[PDB]
Every structure is written in structure tokens, then in C-alpha cells.
Amino acid sequence: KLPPGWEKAMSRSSGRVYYFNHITNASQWERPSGEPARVRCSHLLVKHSQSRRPSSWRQEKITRTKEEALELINGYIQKIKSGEEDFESLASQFSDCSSAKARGDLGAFSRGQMQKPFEDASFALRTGEMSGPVFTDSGIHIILRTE
Ligand SMILES: Cn1nc(CO)c2ccccc21
Ligand SMILES: Cn1nc(CO)c2ccccc21
Ligand SMILES: Cn1nc(CO)c2ccccc21
């Protein structure tokens, strides 16, 4: 039926069908469109107190809760989807990953290099697509597949 990871669901608030991807946590109204040795991704990381390393270039001691991290991630996704902000702009300003200085770009990678949920989401994204919140031991990620 649908590309890897996609399923149909019903909006609680509207009653209209939508599509959700359980690998990437992406969700959208439109039916999803249409694997490579490597992908290229950018990400925005929000760390929390249970991150493997609760520290970043933004904050020496990261104290926010995982739930608070998820709310930040949700808010960034909303601004990216509305066009109010660009992913690259938000990553540069707010990613707790040092890749913030490269607008979140991580370069190209294969399977067997990244943390597993990150890898799975990255390879399930089509070129140009963005994930929903993806959880790893680093924190919570928004992932943008660029190649
Ligand atoms: C961890 N990481 N990975 C990349 C790849 O762009 C990068 C670039 C600048 C700073 C930190 C970085
Ligand atoms: C600048 N740069 N680039 C990469 C991966 O390409 C990387 C990984 C760890 C730290 C810095 C890094
Ligand atoms: C080893 N590894 N795994 C991930 C996935 O979060 C990651 C992100 C940035 C730099 C290195 C990284």
C-alpha cells in the first residue's frame, strides 16, 4: 500500500484521514509519495536531563525534562511547517548538537554509523522530507533528509 513505515489514521479533531509514519514520526494529510547506500541528513537536537550527555554548546548543564524537550521540538516543527521559520535557522540557533554551526548538517552516512532510531528515521525519509520527533539517547531530534 504505502511506503515503509506509513499507516492511515483518523484525525481526532477533524475526522479526516491522515498518514503517520511510525519510523520517522512524520504525519501529514497527503498520501505519502512513492533504499540507498547512504543518505545525507541534517538535524535539530533538543537535549534533556536524561540525555547521554546533559550538556551542549548552548548550555553547560542541561536541566529541562524530556517532556519539556518534546514540547520544544513540537514547537519547532510547528514553525517549520507553517513557514514561520526555516529548519536550518532553527537548527543553527537551538540545536544542542555542535552540528548547529553547520545548520544541523551531519553529512552523508551509511547504515551502522548513527544511533539506531536516528538511522532508521533517516533512511525511511524521502529526499527533502522531515521527521517528527525522533528519540535517541542523545535527546529528541528533528531530522531533515537532504540527499
Ligand atoms: C558532530 N558534528 N557533525 C558534523 C557534520 O556536519 C559537524 C559539523 C560541525 C560541528 C559538529 C559536527
Ligand atoms: C566537523 N565534523 N564533521 C564530522 C562528521 O563529518 C564530525 C564528527 C564529530 C565532530 C566534528 C565533526
Ligand atoms: C554517532 N552519532 N549518532 C548520532 C545519532 O543521534 C549522531 C549525531 C551527531 C553526531 C554523531 C552521532
Residues 115 and 138 in one domain: yes
DSSP 109-135: EETTSS-HHHHHHHHHSPTT-B---EE
Residue with CA nearest ligand 1 atom 12: 99
3-class SS at 17?
Answer: strand
Q: Are strands 105-110 and 27-28 parallel, antiparallel or unpaired?
A: unpaired
CA distances from 130 to 57, 58, 100 (A): 24, 23, 17
Structure method: X-ray
Write out the residue range of the structural domain in which residue 122 sits: 38-147
CATH of the domain at 93: 3.10.50.40
Kindly state the DSSP code that residue 15 receives in the 8-state scheme: -
Same domain, 25 and 43: no
List the CATH number of the domain containing 24.
2.20.70.10
What residues flank ligand 3, with Cβ below 6 Å? 97, 106, 114-115, 118, 136, 138
Pair (26, 54) in one structural domain? no
For atom 3 of ligand 3, the residue with the nearest CA is 114
Buried/exposed code over 12-39 (b: 16+ C-beta within 10 A; e: otherwise): eeeeeeebbbebbbbeeeeebeeeeeeb
Nearest partner of 99 among 49, 139, 67, judged by Cα: 139
Resolution in angstrom units: 1.6
Closest atom of ligand 3 to 136 CA is 6
Q: Is 96 found in the same domain as 79?
A: yes
47 and 108 co-located in one domain: yes
- Contact between residue 95 and residue 106 where contact means Cβ atoms under 8 Å apart: no
Q: Got the DSSP string for 70-111?
A: HHHHHHHHHHHHHTSS-HHHHHHHH-SSGGGGGTTEEEEEET
